[PDB]
Symmetry: C21
Subunit: 88 residues, 21 copies
Amino acid sequence: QFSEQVNYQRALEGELARTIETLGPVKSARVHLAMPSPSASVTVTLEPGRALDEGQISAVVHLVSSAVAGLPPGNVTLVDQSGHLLTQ
Amino acid sequence: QFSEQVNYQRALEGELARTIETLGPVKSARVHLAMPSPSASVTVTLEPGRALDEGQISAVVHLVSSAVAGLPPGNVTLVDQSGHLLTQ
Amino acid sequence: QFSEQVNYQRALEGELARTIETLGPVKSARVHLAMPSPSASVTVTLEPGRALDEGQISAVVHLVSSAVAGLPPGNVTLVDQSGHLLTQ
Amino acid sequence: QFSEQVNYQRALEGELARTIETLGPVKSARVHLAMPSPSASVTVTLEPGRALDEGQISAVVHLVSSAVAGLPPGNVTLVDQSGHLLTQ
Amino acid sequence: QFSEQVNYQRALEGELARTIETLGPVKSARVHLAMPSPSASVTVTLEPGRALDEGQISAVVHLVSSAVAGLPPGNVTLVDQSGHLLTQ
Amino acid sequence: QFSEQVNYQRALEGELARTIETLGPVKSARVHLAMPSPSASVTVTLEPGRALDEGQISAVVHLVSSAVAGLPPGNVTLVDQSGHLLTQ
Amino acid sequence: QFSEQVNYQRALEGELARTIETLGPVKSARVHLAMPSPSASVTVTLEPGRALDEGQISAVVHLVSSAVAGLPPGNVTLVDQSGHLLTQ
Amino acid sequence: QFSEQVNYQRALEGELARTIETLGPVKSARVHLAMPSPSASVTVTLEPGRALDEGQISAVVHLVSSAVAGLPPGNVTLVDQSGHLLTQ
Amino acid sequence: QFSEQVNYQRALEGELARTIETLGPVKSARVHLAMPSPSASVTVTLEPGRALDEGQISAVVHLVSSAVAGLPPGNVTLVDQSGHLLTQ
Amino acid sequence: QFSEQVNYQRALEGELARTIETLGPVKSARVHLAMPSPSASVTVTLEPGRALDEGQISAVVHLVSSAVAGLPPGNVTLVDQSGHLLTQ
Amino acid sequence: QFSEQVNYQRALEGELARTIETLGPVKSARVHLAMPSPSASVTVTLEPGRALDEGQISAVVHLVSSAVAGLPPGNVTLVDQSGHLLTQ
Amino acid sequence: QFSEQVNYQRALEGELARTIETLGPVKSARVHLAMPSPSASVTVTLEPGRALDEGQISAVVHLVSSAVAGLPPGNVTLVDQSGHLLTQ
Amino acid sequence: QFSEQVNYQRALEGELARTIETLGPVKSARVHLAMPSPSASVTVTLEPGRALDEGQISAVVHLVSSAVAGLPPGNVTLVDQSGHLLTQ
Amino acid sequence: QFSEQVNYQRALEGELARTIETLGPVKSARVHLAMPSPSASVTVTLEPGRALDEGQISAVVHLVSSAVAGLPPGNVTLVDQSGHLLTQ
Amino acid sequence: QFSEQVNYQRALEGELARTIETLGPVKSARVHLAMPSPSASVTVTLEPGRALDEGQISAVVHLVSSAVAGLPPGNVTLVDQSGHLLTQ
Amino acid sequence: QFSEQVNYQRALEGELARTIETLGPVKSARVHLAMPSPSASVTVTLEPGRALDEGQISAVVHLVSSAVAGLPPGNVTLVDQSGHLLTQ
Amino acid sequence: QFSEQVNYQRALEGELARTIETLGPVKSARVHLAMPSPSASVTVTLEPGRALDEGQISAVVHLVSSAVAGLPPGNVTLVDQSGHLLTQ
Amino acid sequence: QFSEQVNYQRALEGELARTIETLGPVKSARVHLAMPSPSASVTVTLEPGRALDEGQISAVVHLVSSAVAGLPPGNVTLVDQSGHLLTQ
Amino acid sequence: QFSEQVNYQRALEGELARTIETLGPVKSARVHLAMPSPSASVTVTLEPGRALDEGQISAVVHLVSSAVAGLPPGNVTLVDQSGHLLTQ
Amino acid sequence: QFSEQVNYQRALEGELARTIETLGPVKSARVHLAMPSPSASVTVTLEPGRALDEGQISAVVHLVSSAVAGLPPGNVTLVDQSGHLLTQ
Amino acid sequence: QFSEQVNYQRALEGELARTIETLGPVKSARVHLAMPSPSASVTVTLEPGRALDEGQISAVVHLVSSAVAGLPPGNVTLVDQSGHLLTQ
């Protein structure tokens, strides 16, 4: 009951990442989920010479807050490849 | 009871995506469902040089809110390939 | 008890779609059902150069609301291949 | 107890359809039943250049409302091959 | 207990039909029974150039209402091959 | 306990019919029984150019009402090969 | 417990018939019993050019009412090969 | 417990008959017993040109009423080969 | 417990008969017992040209009433080969 | 427990008879016992031209009343080969 | 527990008899016991031309009343080969 | 528990007899015991031309009353080969 | 538990006898024990031309009363080979 | 539990005897024990021409009363080979 | 239930480390989690000649506080390769 | 539990005897123990021409009273080879 | 449940040590954990000619206090290769 | 549980004896223990021409009273090879 | 549950010793733990010509008090190779 | 549970003895323990021409009182090879 | 649970001894533990021509009191190879 609850999450994370990857100014993403009070942390490498606008942050935040059961958009952490914690 | 509840969802998501794909200005979609309080997140790549009108958003939102049991149209997140969180 | 409840639905959806297909100005349909409070979402591609009249919407809506147990005609979503959410 | 309750219905529907087919101005019918509060939806293709009169609707409606246990004639939906929801 | 309750009915229907067939102005009949509050629906093709008189309707109605347990003659629906719902 | 309760009836019906057949102005009979409140329906083809008198109806009615347990002579339906519901 | 209760009756009926056959003006008889409130129905073909007198009816009626447990002589139905319900 | 209770009776009847046969003016007898409130019915063919006197009836009646447990001499029915119900 | 209770009786009857046979004016006897309230019925063929005196009846009656448990001499029926019920 | 209770009696009877046989004016005896309230019936053929005196009856009566458990000398029936019930 | 209780008695009787045989004026004896309230019956053939005196009766009576458990000397019946019930 | 209780007695009797045999004026003895209230019966053949004195009776009586458990010397019966019940 | 309780006694008796044999004026003894209230009976053949004195009786009586559990010296019976009950 | 309780005693007796044998004026002893209230009986053959003094009796009495559990010296019986009960 | 709870953590730690590694001024990281009140400790080797700014600390702290269930950002310890405890 | 409780005693007795044997004026001893209230009896053959002094008796008495559990020195019986009960 | 709880700790200790090793002025570390109220003891060999500053102690203390569940930074003991207990 | 409790004692006794043997003026000892209230009895053969002093008795008494659990020095009996009970 | 609790301790002791060995003025250590209220005892051989300072004692004491669960630094005993109990 | 409790003691005794042997003026010792209230008895052979001083007694007494659980130094008995109970 | 509790102690004792051996003026030690209220006894052979000072006693006493669970330093007994109980 456990070794495929965490093997499901291992692919949901790898699926959520492959969609954020196909999002324009995101060369590669890397999601981790914390499903017990849930939360997630997305690390994105933007395309060389780009920067996510303030609305493009809610794109990725909601793109993840909705794909996971019970995770509000406030518990999602977005981080570039240059530090830069984007989501408050 | 679990490994085919989430294997059902894996095809419902891939079925819901193949119908939104056949919707005109949608070159490819990518759905994720959060079924415990449900919600979904659709990421669509529009046809090159197109943009979903304000009524075409309710098309895709209801096209998904109805294909899933108990998911209201407010919990559906639509996102382009250019950020642009379309559904409030 | 599960893997053929959802395998029944997989054919009911594919049966309901093949009848709407044989409906005149409907080149191909694509039904999804949400059976727990039920609802359905039909996506139809009309014949090239056609448009469903206001009574032809109640045709397809009732053609689906009756073929599924407990689904009222208000919970059925009809959508063209051009956005156009037809059922309110 | 399930896989032949719905395999019974799969033939009752295909039997009810083959009798409506042998009804004069009906080139082919296509019945779906919703047996939990029951209801049915008949889609008929009329013979080329025909139209069901107002009494011929009660023919097909009662021809189906009686062949199914507990289904009143008000819950039967009849639809042509040209939209045209015939039963109110 | 089920797959021969409905396999009994499948022959009772086919037996009741072969007797109505041997009834004079009835070239072929086709009975369906609804046994849970029972009811039946007979569709008869009359001999070419004939029509069932008002007493010949009670013949076929009672010929069926009595061959089935608990089915009153009011719940029997008789229909020609030309629409024409004969039994009220 | 079922598949030979209805296989008994299948021969009782075929036995009751072969005795009515040997009854003079009856070229062939065809009985169906409804044994749960019982009832029966006899369809007789009279000899060419004959007609059952009013007492010959009580012959066949009692010939059947007595051969079946609990079936009164009022619940027996007799019908010719020409419509003609004989028993009220 | 059933398939030889009704296989006993199948021979008792065929035994009761072979004794009535050896009764003078009875060329062949044919008995059916209704054993749950019992009753029986005898159909006799009289010798060519004979007729059972009013006392010869009580012969056959008691010849059957006594050979079956609990069957009064009032529940026995005697019928010729010419209609003619003999026992009231 | 049943198939030799009625196989006992089948020989008791055939034994009781072979003794009445050896009784003078009785060329052959034929007994049937009704053992649940018991009763019996004897059919005797008298020797050609004979007739049982009024005391010879109590012979055969008691010859049977005593050979069966609990059967009074009033429940025994004696019948010739010419109708003629002898025992009241 | 049954098939040799009645197989015991089958020899007791055949033993009781072989002793009455060796009784002088009795060429052959034939006993039947009714053992549930018991009773018996003896049929004797007297030697050609003999007749049992009034005391010779109590011989055979007691010869049987005592050889069977609980059978009084009043429940024993003696009958000649010429009718003639001897025991009241 | 039964088939040798009555197989014991079958030899006790045949033993009691072989002793009465060796009793002088008794050429052969034949005993039957009724053991549930017991009783017995002895049939004796006296030597040709002899007759049991009144005391020789109590010989045979007590010779049997004592060899059987619980059988009083009043329930023993003695009978010659010429009728003649000897014991009252 | 039974077939050697009565096989014990079968030898006790044959042992008691072989001792009375060795008693002088007793050429052969023959004992039967009635062991449930016990009793016995001795039949003795005296030596040719002898007779048991009144004290020789108590010899044989006590010779048997004591060899059997619970049998008083009053329940022992002694009988010669010439009738002659010796013990009162 | 029985077939060697009475096989013990069969040797105790044969042992008690072989000691009385070695007693002087006793050519052979023959003991029977009645062990349920016990008693015994000794039959002795005295040496030719001898007779047991009044004290020699208490010898044999006590020689037996003591060799058996619970048997008083009053319940022991001694008998010669010439009748002569010696013990009162 | 029985067949060696009485096989023990069979040797104790034969042991007690072989010691009394070695006692001077006792050529051979023969003991029987009655062990349920116990008692014993010794029969001794004295040496030819001897007689046990009054004290030699208490020798043999106590020689036996003590070798058996619970047997008082009053319940021991001593008897010569010439009658002569020695112990009161 | 029994066949070696009495096989123990069989050697204790034979051991107790072999020690009394080695006691001077005792050529051979022979002990029997009565172990349920115990007691013993010693029979000693003294050396030819000897006699046990009054103290030599307490030797043998205590030599046995102590070698057996619970046996007082009053319940030990000592007897010579010449009668002579030594212990009171 | 244990050896893969801590084998899950062994990869989550190695996954969390490979994402912090792809973060710009982080040449290699090394995470340890303390999941019972959780906490984590990250040791990072910065790129040669770099230093994490004060906002780049909240990047790595939230990048870890969110990827683990229930771990607040206060319980995360960040340390360089030169001592330098960065998180208070 | 028994056959080595008394096989232990058989060696304890033979061990206790071999130590008293090695005691000076004791050529051979012979002990028997009575272990249920215990007691013992020692028989000693003194060296030819010796006699145990009054203190040498307490030697052997205590040498045995102590080697056995619960046996006081008063219950030990010492006896020479010449009678002579030494211990009171 | 034990042999891999302490085999987990054996690697956590060896993992925690390999990270402190990669910390600059730490040539090799050696951790031991005390997990029941937990505590740990780190022994570090500094690089030749170095010394941990006062902030570099909180580095290693928190680097360990956080990698272990429930271990406060006060229960962590740090020691050089030259004595020098660094953590109070 | 028994056969090595007394096999332990068999060696403890043989061990205790081999130590007293190595005690100077003791050429050989021989111990017996009474372990249920314990006690022991030591028999010692002193070296030729020696005698145990009054303190050498407490040596051997305590050498044994202490080597056995619960045995006081008062329950130990010491005896020479010349009688001489040494311990009071 | 035991043989590896003490086999764990056997390596923890050998691990704790190998770290104290790598501590500078400690050529070899040797730890023993007392884990039930725990305590430990360290014996250290210092490098030839060295001595642990007063702070170097708290090094080794805390290096051990922390590596073991629940062991305070007061229950740790440190001892040189020259006596010298260092920890109070 | 027993045969190695006393096999443990057999080596503890042999171990305790081999240490006292290595004690200077003790050429060989021999310990016995009494472990149920424990006690021990040591027998020591001193080196030829030595004697244990008053403090050397407490050496051996405590050397044994401490090596055994619960044994006070007062219950230890020390004895030389010359009698001489050393411990009071 | 026992044979390795005392096999653990057998090595703990042999381990504790090998550390005291490496203690300077201790050529060899020999420890015994008493673990039920524990205690131990150490016997040490000092190096030839040495003597443990008063502080070197607390070294060895605490070196043992701490290596064993629950053993205070007062219950440890230290003894040289020359008597000399060192620990009070």
